[PDB]
């Protein structure tokens, strides 16, 4: 019973997935009586959390009754009671919490509030499907770098294009709008200013449901971002440029003016932990790295990705001189290729979508 | 739905011949008199007997009036013996249940016909799909005069063969190189390029337990390099074609040809793949598995010579420009120039993932 | 996508199963800008409706927005304005109705009184699941009278006893655990006296979590009820029974002390149609009819049931004098015997469960 | 491999069902050098063997071959050599049989003959599977009695007819049609003249090419069967009726000498164990009872039923002066009411069916 709780707070947490954005999606349930009276989730950003909902719905049924949270109470104080302190004021008897909040200081704190208030805390139910319920969210917070995905498509050899770099059909209209959607569950989209110089992209997430804009990072080592381009003056959405100290000084200046962020790297060629750190530090929670199989490399020869996901297409390219998936350095002796696992191969189309994790 | 039961079983009966019959398809056949199973037959051993004659041996003379069900349409050329459409219509047979004509255009409908001549009703194509199956590769020969060709390789899941440096160790699963052994067992031929000879020195052999006769080893070659050392050569486990040209050395040419070791030779430079599925055509060679050569593969791929590609990829990323790349050499500079295929299957092999495509 | 909605809305409704007492079970979901901003469901008996709940969670967001009610919003004026009102008032723009009330003097009243606020109505999605959801109570609304269920256990040759009325290990452990899930979706639990000078069963419900327990109802003509059986001494449950003129005054004071409520029908044999009204006139809107072989087969000739639950056991159970599944007059000619239809066949433990419902 | 070839044997063996009358099914592989090369089943009563085509079929190949053979071959030195000899005669090195043969007197016979010849001899290869195909079969030579088969048609409520003998059918046309699979796979049929009397059946396999009617037997304790019956006039089926002493002299001969076949009982009732032993006396490997209330309830009083098989039509009749399934004696304690386990269970049009079987 205390599992189909905590289930059905995962639920109604579920209720909450990709409209909360940077918030995390929590479930909050209060039974009393061995009846429910309060249910909940986090469903907007800014907004009432979950534990929030549930007990103003419990109204006096709180009192003395129980409470399931997916994820730890909140203790932060200062413009509202931290649902934690909500939990104590209503007179809630026990809270089952499915895990601790990822954040490393913050971890634990919410269980103290309550527990020296002198309520009974139970941790661990079904964190199994809570934690994932948040992936990306509790990798942030633990880690303090990014969740990353790596995405590209291909040919059934692993090409990206032909020998005279054209690659116009390589995956069916079905692929590409499928890639979209992870347009959409990314605070951030990356690729290297080759793609720009190529192919002039928006990185705009055109799905009909959209009201926020990804970061649009571009790792541009030596300034060479094409001034006119999309990413640069449809101003449709934020733009990251990360350069070194080899960027020419007037064109940052001009660029700028666009209201475009200039990141000066200290090192003289971009490091991928380096910016990764750097888009932490500025509030970026996952990043889906796109384009560059040069760009795909760096991530991939320092093990910056969480996932990959390559969509293949039943044709065969060829060529000697055809590029490949994975560009760069890469790895020298297979003693050394990291073991990956394949975690998902669903059909999209015509084509194939294999997506694998690391470990 | 009775009339799919007979055919099932037919077809069903045919595949005990699955293990030898060489060159000979698979055929099968059941004699039913009034509502009872009398007689059913197979293609058991290559020139021996066909599948209508044991059936229709065994049903004596509930034959009849009787009807009967043939997965193939029953021969009607004159040999040594008479031929089962003879046999059929000299047993009393009413009626025939064949599934699918014969593959020779030259040859089609000819049987049809005879028993047609002799009153006999002849209805067709029940379970025509799964008598395509059955003998899905003959077939193919026969209706192209050119051998079934199957392309597998096994690489990373970026695409990569080998590492920047060569190295291809712990490239696939145990369990892949095992689902890939079953291949060599259901192929009278395994192509593979000289390159690959030294590359690991292969024996290019099934072992699968039951094996009968095995496959004909094919090396392509150029310059006759194949080394001397060892296996398709000094390893007397089968036969071992090898394509080669006029680069290719007089002495060493004939000193190989002393170990039972052929030597095809080409009028040109450069080992055309539709001019060597052409020869092997002539050799009685109906199928072939090619394995070996990222260029090997990558000539059937241009020359658009195949009717099934089959990679295995690993839960790997070995990157690096400069890493070999699973189909190499010309391949399409045009992507409107690049033929569309089909996915025919998606199976988890262990931690790798095979996928099987086929052409338009 | 709409069902999507109606669907979470369904599930909402599901929440409050049992905590309603006479009222339906409903869900409500707010929808703005594709974003799910309210949930609600009816959780306690004369408490906020699912309306109430899922338009106070959705707060402002409700302008303009679209909501999905499994039920027809209320629309009479009561103590607090009716939720068709609520929905006015709020803004919503959009409201999609899964069915309209169950009766006839109100269905399409709120409908209507929406559109003519300018809002649009759209009805009919997963009606049926709207439908089953509070298909008892359906049923109660729709006829006046409750919700019939007959259950009975017998061998496979259909015997509920050996001819020594020895019915000991008739049902397995597993069949009479899943029977007792319908002690738990129906108010009360019938049988006749036989039933309890036989076995004096408690007909109590013994699941997990179990709040209430349902009405025991007792058909008793003479009042020869043991006064020491458990349905009069447990007072693990509420005990009616219903007699005629022939019982004992002075017996139904000693009963009345115990807590017992009896029903003194005017007739000289007990008639279930009478029974069913008076029932019903108590709110009773569901029985569980668990039997006695005649008490069955009066039910089944008024025709006075919705479902027929028999459990078949893998024994035979000879003998002429061993009683049958229904007993009673029955019918005399196979054209008179109205036709069921095979509800669900499902198999528990070694025994075969057999449901079917009539027409 | 071993059990693949044997696999094929059965499977070729089911080929000849229905088609060989008292003869068992059998199938047959012979393999050379890894090569299936012959394969055979008894397709006709009277006809060659199993043996006798794979070997013909193998010819040449025959020569130090193995052999898989799903019932030990027969060794009777009768007009011709026996499977037994066959075998050896034809250099088959080794024999695979699955299980042996059903008569005590010859179990054994055979795998010997062959042992003392060379030949190496292994059973036991899917002895399961080879004990499915010949079931009925089997079970006469293990006890020297009929296999019986118990089928009955009742209500939802287990009723066969109204309280006024109304049986106007309770299950569907569908559902006689299904029963009559079993007039074809049971070699008599057995009914009570009650049954007799009342129906005035015909008991003839009306399905497809029958090529041999079951024999029809009716229980008449007096005789008092009507002598304008179908059964008894009719000629399409033999008929034999069983009786005790109660019937008149004349009226016997009259039957008699219509071809019916008469058998007295020297015991007041008749007993079922007698009527059993009789008519295995009398070749009858099994038979399909179907007939009569007290008819049944004496078979499952005895124990004497190998299945049991009830449809049950979506209807309740009611009455308690109605016929249920299982009438006789029965048993008074639910103690010695033995079980039996469900085997299938398959809807046939709007009717249920169930079969099951002792122990
Ligand atoms: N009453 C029913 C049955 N009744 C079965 C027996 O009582 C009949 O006497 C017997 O099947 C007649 O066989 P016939 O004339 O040779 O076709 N059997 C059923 O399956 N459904 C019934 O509703
Ligand atoms: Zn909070
Ligand atoms: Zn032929
Ligand atoms: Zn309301
Ligand atoms: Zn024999």
Same mark, same amino acid.
């Not at 007990?55 to 009192?63: C, K, L, R």
């Not at 055109?206 to 449809?234: F, G, M, Y």
């Not at 890469?330 to 191969?345: N, R, W, Y």
């Given at each position: 019973?205390?599992?189909?709780?905590?289930?059905?707070?995962?639920?109604?947490?579920?209720?909450?997935?990709?409209?909360?954005?940077?918030?995390?999606?929590?479930?909050?349930?209060?039974?009393?009586?061995?009846?429910?009276?309060?249910?909940?989730?986090?469903?907007?950003?800014?907004?009432?959390?979950?534990?929030?909902?549930? =007990?103003?719905?419990?109204?006096?049924?709180?009192?003395?009754?129980?409470?399931?949270?997916?994820?730890?109470?909140?203790?932060?104080?200062?413009?509202?009671?931290?649902?934690?302190?909500?939990?104590?004021?209503?007179?809630?008897?026990?809270?089952?919490?499915?895990?601790?909040?990822?954040?490393?200081?913050?971890?634990?704190?919410?269980?103290?509030?309550?527990?020296?208030?002198?309520?009974?805390?139970?941790?661990?139910?079904?964190?199994?499907?809570?934690?994932?319920?948040?992936?990306?969210?509790?990798?942030?917070?633990?880690?303090?770098?990014?969740?990353?995905?790596?995405?590209?498509?291909?040919?059934?050899?692993?090409?990206?294009?032909?020998?005279?770099?054209?690659?116009? &059909?390589?995956?069916?209209?079905?692929?590409?709008?499928?890639?979209?959607?992870?347009?959409?569950?990314?605070?951030?989209?990356?690729?290297?200013?080759?793609?720009?110089?190529?192919?002039?992209?928006?990185?705009?997430?055109?799905?009909?449901?959209?009201?926020?804009?990804?970061?649009?990072?571009?790792?541009?080592?030596?300034?060479?971002?094409?001034?006119?381009?999309?990413?640069?003056?449809?101003?449709?959405?934020?733009? &990251?440029?990360?350069?070194?100290?080899?960027?020419?000084?007037?064109?940052?200046?001009?660029?700028?003016?666009?209201?475009?962020?200039?990141?000066?790297?200290?090192?003289?060629?971009?490091?991928?932990?380096?910016?990764?750190?750097?888009?932490?530090?500025?509030?970026?929670?996952?990043?889906?790295?796109?384009?560059?199989?040069?760009?795909?490399?760096?991530?991939?020869?320092?093990?910056?990705?969480?996932?990959? =996901?390559?969509?293949?297409?039943?044709?065969?390219?060829?060529?000697?001189?055809?590029?490949?998936?994975?560009?760069?350095?890469?790895?020298?002796?297979?003693?050394?290729?990291?073991?990956?696992?394949?975690?998902?191969?669903?059909?999209?189309?015509?084509? =194939?979508?294999?997506?694998?994790?690391?470990?």
């Amino acid at each position: 019973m205390e599992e189909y709780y905590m289930k059905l707070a995962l639920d109604l947490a579920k209720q909450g997935e990709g409209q909360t954005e940077s918030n995390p999606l929590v479930g909050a349930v209060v039974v009393k009586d061995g009846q429910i009276v309060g249910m909940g989730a986090h469903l907007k950003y800014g907004e009432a959390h979950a534990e929030v909902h549930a =007990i103003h719905m419990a109204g006096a049924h709180a009192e003395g009754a129980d409470i399931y949270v997916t994820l730890e109470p909140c203790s932060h104080y200062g413009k509202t009671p931290p649902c934690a302190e909500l939990i104590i004021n209503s007179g809630i008897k026990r809270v089952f919490v499915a895990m601790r909040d990822p954040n490393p200081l913050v971890a634990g704190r919410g269980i103290s509030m309550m527990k020296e208030a002198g309520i009974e805390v139970r941790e661990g139910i079904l964190a199994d499907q809570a934690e994932r319920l948040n992936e990306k969210f509790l990798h942030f917070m633990r880690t303090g770098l990014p969740y990353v995905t790596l995405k590209a498509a291909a040919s059934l050899d692993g090409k990206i294009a032909t020998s005279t770099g054209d690659s116009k &059909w390589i995956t069916s209209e079905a692929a590409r709008q499928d890639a979209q959607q992870y347009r959409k569950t990314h605070q951030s989209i990356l690729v290297g200013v080759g793609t720009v110089k190529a192919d002039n992209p928006s990185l705009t997430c055109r799905l009909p449901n959209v009201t926020k804009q990804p970061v649009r990072v571009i790792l541009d080592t030596v300034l060479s971002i094409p001034e006119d381009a999309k990413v640069i003056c449809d101003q449709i959405a934020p733009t &990251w440029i990360f350069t070194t100290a080899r960027a020419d000084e007037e064109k940052k200046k001009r660029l700028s003016a666009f209201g475009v962020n200039i990141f000066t790297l200290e090192t003289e060629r971009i490091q991928i932990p380096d910016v990764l750190k750097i888009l932490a530090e500025e509030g970026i929670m996952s990043v889906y790295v796109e384009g560059g199989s040069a760009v795909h490399g760096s991530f991939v020869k320092e093990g910056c990705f969480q996932e990959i =996901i390559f969509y293949f297409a039943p044709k065969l390219i060829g060529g000697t001189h055809a590029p490949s998936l994975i560009s760069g350095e890469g790895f020298q002796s297979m003693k050394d290729v990291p073991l990956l696992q394949f975690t998902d191969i669903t059909q999209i189309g015509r084509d =194939i979508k294999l997506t694998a994790k690391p470990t």
